[PDB]
Amino acid sequence: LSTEATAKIVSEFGRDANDTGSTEVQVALLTAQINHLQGHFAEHKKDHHSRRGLLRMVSQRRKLLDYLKRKDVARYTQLIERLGLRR
Amino acid sequence: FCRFTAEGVQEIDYKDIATLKNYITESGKIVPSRITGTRAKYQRQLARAIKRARYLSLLPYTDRHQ
Amino acid sequence: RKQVSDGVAHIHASFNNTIVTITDRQGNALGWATAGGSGFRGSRKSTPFAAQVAAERCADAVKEYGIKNLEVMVKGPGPGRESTIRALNAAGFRITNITDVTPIPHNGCRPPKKRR
Amino acid sequence: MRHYEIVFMVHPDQSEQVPGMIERYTAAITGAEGKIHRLEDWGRRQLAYPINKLHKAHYVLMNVEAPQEVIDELETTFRFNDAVIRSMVMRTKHAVTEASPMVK
Amino acid sequence: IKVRENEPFDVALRRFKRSCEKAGVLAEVRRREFYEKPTTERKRAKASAVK
RNA sequence: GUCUCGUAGAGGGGGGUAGAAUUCCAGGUGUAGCGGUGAAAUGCGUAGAGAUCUGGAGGAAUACCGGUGGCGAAGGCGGCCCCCUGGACGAAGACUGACGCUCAGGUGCGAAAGCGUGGGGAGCAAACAGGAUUAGAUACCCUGGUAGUCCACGCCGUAAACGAUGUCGACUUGGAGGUUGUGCCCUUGAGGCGUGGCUUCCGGAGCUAACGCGUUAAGUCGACCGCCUGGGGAGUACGGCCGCA
RNA sequence: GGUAACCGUAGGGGAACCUGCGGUUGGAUCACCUCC
Helix, strand or coil, X not given: CCHHHHHHHHHHHCCCCCCCCCHHHHHHHHHHXXXXXXXXXXXXXXXXCHHHHHXXXXXXXXXXXXXXXXXXXXXXXXXXXXXXXXX | CCCHHHHCCCXXXXXXXXXXXXXXXXXXXXXXXXXXXXXXXXXXXXXXXXXXXXXCCCCCCCCCCC | CCCCCEEXXXXXXXXXXXXXXXXXXXXXXXXEEECCCCCCXXXXXXXXXXXXXXXXXXXXXXXXXXXXXXXXXXXXXXXXXXXXXXXXXXXXXXXXXXXXXXXXXXXXXXXXXXXX | CEEEEEEEEECHHHHHHHHHHXXXXXXXXXXXXXXXXXXXXXXXXXXXXXXXXXXXXXXXXXXXEECHHHHHHHHHHHHHCCCEEEEEEECCCCCCXXXXXXXX | CCCCCCCCCCCCCCCCHHXXXXXXXXXXXXXXXXXXXXXXXHHHHHHCCCC
């Protein structure tokens, strides 16, 4: 995204501006990149090199969610419903 | 012998003519690196500048043109 | 007829033939000669002697216009064709500058292959 | 908003309103708060090789920090109007301002 | 190179294409093909370094 | 793994734009040949060619820089500029707290050639037509020239797709160079001490049948996956799946 | 600062193979007394 977008997004899910490393803020950042970038491939059919990065980010988000699933279901469910993630 | 590493320039410019005219042969071809001894990155930026100035018709393609 | 006195000339230097043309600066062709315009054929034409005799043969066509100074461009990679201009110099034409133009395509149309 | 470098080229007989071009273009850039760092007029100049059977034409340079929409509006204006023969647009890493060697 | 020189006539001066131009042009270009099998061509240029 | 600041780069798309050159068209000059081979011939030629000049239309790849340089998981990527965007590395500092490695099935990408529908067509060019020549042989050689090569939306999923070396870790003397970051010193102008990535070449211990590899292993170990069991028949027959073929 | 061969594929044809497009270096062959 951009520096101001990241600075405003870290506070909505993390801690006093110094954490920026928690699972919640991580998944927030990845999901922001995915939601922004989906409009790129809606027009650029032929690109296949950034698709690898897209799939890597999706896999990282999936891995983080599966870790949170075992870690604490309460924050897992809170995060998914407030972010709009199907599962 | 090199000039850019001696003078410590961070970014080499394309608008000025004096520096990059020295690094062209008489026929408009860019001089190879190993002839002049300039470092590789600065040679690359040189070539970038040659194309950039050559687009603006500040420096000729080759001496065939009148 | 019409006096030039500072004429220009073009020579073609292909592997197989040589063409010499004298120009009145602005494109205008007044006289020309070729290595094949004297019955030459085969290996007798490849050597630059054919080019030299063609060059001297152009003279009897050029001298009607009274040209003293001459300008020339050479085009073609043919072996031994650089000696042609010496013939025009010996013919009495005052050469002052010999330029060269070889058309180099900037890796454009693909070149065909010769015989194996 | 980011830095940009722009030059363009003007037909000789059409040089009489080049101040008009500078006025209109600068007004366009400042119309969206865009900031101009430098303007240079190099006057009539000879060309290395001819463009449109022309051996000379007029030169103008500027260095601005301005948003994308105004950069596109400029570039569309240059491509639409035939009074300019050539154009150039660049990005720069910082707001360079010191004296250009071209006039040194 | 525009060959304009002083008063002396026919001082040759055509010889110096060695430094200005790669001698292979118009033989590797505009006819036949080249640039294939490059590595063996480059390697021999330095394999002879010895002391 | 995440964040702050930066660096390099033919990483991938979309759109413009510039010069060089092969064609074709229009108009001047000018004459008898041009072209191609060892000769040649077919072929172009004066209701006006090539050669030269001016102008114009259209297509493809971007000379020079350009390198045993760079990027990418691989295939592969090279004029310049704008827009979108994937990945790598350096400096300190902070944060999450085992979130990891591999991967049967599965999904995606995958040079060129080849199909399906529609465009474009300069050059090149399988098949094919003509001439010629050796050698019973055509083929090689030379004129023309169709698919194709280019662009749109899909199939095909094959190569000596090779570094003939699967991915991920930790541990074991040296030497030379390249490319790209960065600390210490008054920098006593391009210079000195040190630390990181990625790369090319010698060579010790060790290993291998040998050639050789040798901190980027084919050395000493561990985790997982794929594959092999004499040569030909044969990556072939019959089936299943995939494919319009 | 000599030469080739093997791949993938498409068109043509048998002592035997050609070209069009892309790729790789694994760029070279032999070791035959009785007589034909």
